[PDB]
Inverse folding.
């Protein structure tokens, strides 16, 4: 296959629409890995997505330690 | 309440050099002759690759410090503080803020210089992280510090109202919470005015980003001198080698070629050494920036003149071309007044020392007050402790102490 | 290894060894080849020394950082964030390794959080009450005071609260009762 990235042209890798942690950095936010029996090039995932409940009169207090 | 700006460089520009094109051009005879000098280019490639990976390591260490990406809730009330200029703006396609846009715009037929340098074997590689990812990291850090506080730097993010967070920080610097709870509106107005002044200064002044511009200028000057070195004879007949080959016989052409090769190799060596030194300095700056990010943004620092000039309250990060910008919010006293003091109070033949504050007098009476704010109170046994008689301490004075129990005995 | 391998270069001379150069050419002419070889080898060795100096400087910086970490994290307790580990620092231990040190950091991390409703101050008898070293919480029916980093509810009293001003200036104040521990024993 052929793929056009801002770092050039990539031949031999198939582009997928998922996102994983980077294994081999190619550049411009594009990384590559060996998975599935094949080589897949993907876009980096910064991390999990979270939201915090904020209001005038709410607090969170811990009840245990490690 | 004061807001101060700090600028720190983080990374550099990644470069790659092609030996054969730079030295021998498009001549095959020089290409054949070059092999005699051994392995002089694998070392150069290794050094440049090391610098290139070092830059990405620097950026990742500085910015990637949060495991989860947070978002601010749609409601934008934070106790009167605006924050609308430093939070992401969804309208623009870059998902950036006003100050970030100003900072990026601040630092900047015919053929472009980049193409001309590329056509001689000097190329620039792209960084691993785009600007959007750095913006997302900055937004996540801002959301975490606004909503959770410093709890997200040591575990899970626990929500807390902004006013109570400010009260905790005031307690940290050494002032009680009632000051904030009674001057919330004034503090919010001061913060908004300071942010507006920062806006005006950024929009007007164009010389506050010197360090990143100096980095860019140094890189440009190094490339310029490397390119200019190609047009010097080094003691030969001419710089152009085809004329040397055509004009005169091989016996002296070999000497001329050797002179040119030695000169160009020496120039490349000098360039690599200067690049190594500059990269070491940039890495030191990046380490300092990472430490500052971990100490001033994810917590409160007691160190003096580290996270701002004054008493530190908190800080905010923003991105910049090849660098980071810190907005420090700090506390400074004003409108001071003179008073008369004593070290202890001798009452009932016993010495009395304050528990938290200091003793003051306004001319006739005596009070106890906190250190960083004028708030007098009557000297009682609840805010005083006794140790020994009053004939040893130098400078003790006479007064009376109030006991909150005897009034209740008779009433 | 690369310094050793550089010895096979010719640097434009007729051979990579000296004895054959001295055993094939007259003294008037061998000088140019000897000069070329000597200059090349000197340049290689100088480059090696310079790179060694730079690497030594970096190692010195790392050693200074390790010394500071040993001074603060091990011999004492550090309040710096993310310096002696992730979390709240408790203590640390050193161990040795070939050309390096290994630090084991023992730290404290909260877990098992729970939601609560809070107010900044309590209005009682026309006066505002603020916590001393805690925070006000409520479980939907009653009110308590608890420490920040652990759950330990307690009854609001005079001993753990202080008063300043009226209750018509603080935003978010609520009405409740503050228990006086002097009258009940006085009236008994």
């Amino acid at each position: 296959n052929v793929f056009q990235t801002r770092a050039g042209c990539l031949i031999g890798a198939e582009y997928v629409n998922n996102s994983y942690e980077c294994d081999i950095p190619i550049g411009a936010g594009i990384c590559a890995s060996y998975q599935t029996q094949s080589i897949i090039a993907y876009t980096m995932s910064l991390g999990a997505e979270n939201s915090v409940a904020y209001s005038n009169n709410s607090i969170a207090i811990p009840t245990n330690f490690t | 309440i004061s807001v101060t700006t700090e600028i720190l460089p983080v990374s550099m520009t990644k470069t790659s050099v092609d030996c054969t094109m730079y030295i021998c051009g498009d001549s095959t005879e020089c290409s054949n002759l070059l092999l005699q000098y051994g392995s002089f280019c694998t070392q150069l490639k290794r050094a440049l690759t090391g610098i290139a990976v070092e830059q990405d390591k620097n950026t990742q260490e500085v910015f990637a410090q949060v495991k989860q990406i947070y978002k601010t809730p749609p409601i934008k009330y934070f106790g009167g503080f605006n924050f609308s200029q430093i939070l992401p703006d969804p309208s623009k396609p870059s998902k950036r803020s006003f100050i970030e846009d100003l900072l990026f715009n601040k630092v900047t037929a015919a053929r472009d210089l980049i193409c001309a340098q590329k056509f001689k074997g000097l190329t620039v590689l792209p960084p691993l992280l785009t600007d959007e990812m750095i913006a997302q990291y900055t937004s996540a850090l801002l959301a975490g510090t606004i909503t959770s506080g410093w709890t997200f730097g040591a575990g899970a993010a626990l929500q807390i109202p902004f006013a109570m967070q400010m009260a905790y920080r005031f307690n940290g610097i050494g002032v009680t919470q009632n000051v904030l709870y009674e001057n919330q509106k004034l503090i919010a107005n001061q913060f908004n005015s300071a942010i507006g002044k920062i806006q005006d200064s950024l929009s007007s002044t164009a010389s506050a980003l010197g360090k990143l511009q100096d980095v860019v200028n140094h890189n440009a000057q190094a490339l310029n001198t490397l390119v200019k070195q190609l047009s010097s004879k080094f003691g030969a007949i001419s710089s152009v080698l085809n004329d040397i080959f055509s004009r005169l016989d091989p016996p002296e052409a070999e000497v001329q070629i050797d002179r040119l090769i030695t000169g160009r190799l020496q120039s490349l060596q000098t360039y690599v050494t200067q690049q190594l030194i500059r990269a070491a300095e940039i890495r030191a700056s990046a380490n300092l920036a990472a430490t500052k990010m971990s100490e001033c943004v994810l917590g409160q620092s007691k160190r003096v003149d580290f996270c701002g000039k004054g008493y530190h309250l908190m800080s905010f990060p923003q991105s910049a071309p090849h660098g980071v910008v810190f907005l420090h919010v700090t506390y400074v006293p004003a409108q001071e007044k003179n008073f008369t003091t004593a070290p202890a109070i001798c009452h009932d033949g016993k010495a009395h020392f304050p528990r938290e504050g200091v003793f003051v007098s306004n001319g006739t009476h005596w009070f106890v007050t906190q250190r960083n704010f004028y708030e007098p109170q009557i000297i009682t046994t609840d805010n005083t402790f006794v140790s020994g008689n009053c004939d040893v301490v130098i400078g003790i004075v006479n007064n009376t102490v109030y006991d909150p129990l005897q009034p209740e005995l008779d009433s």
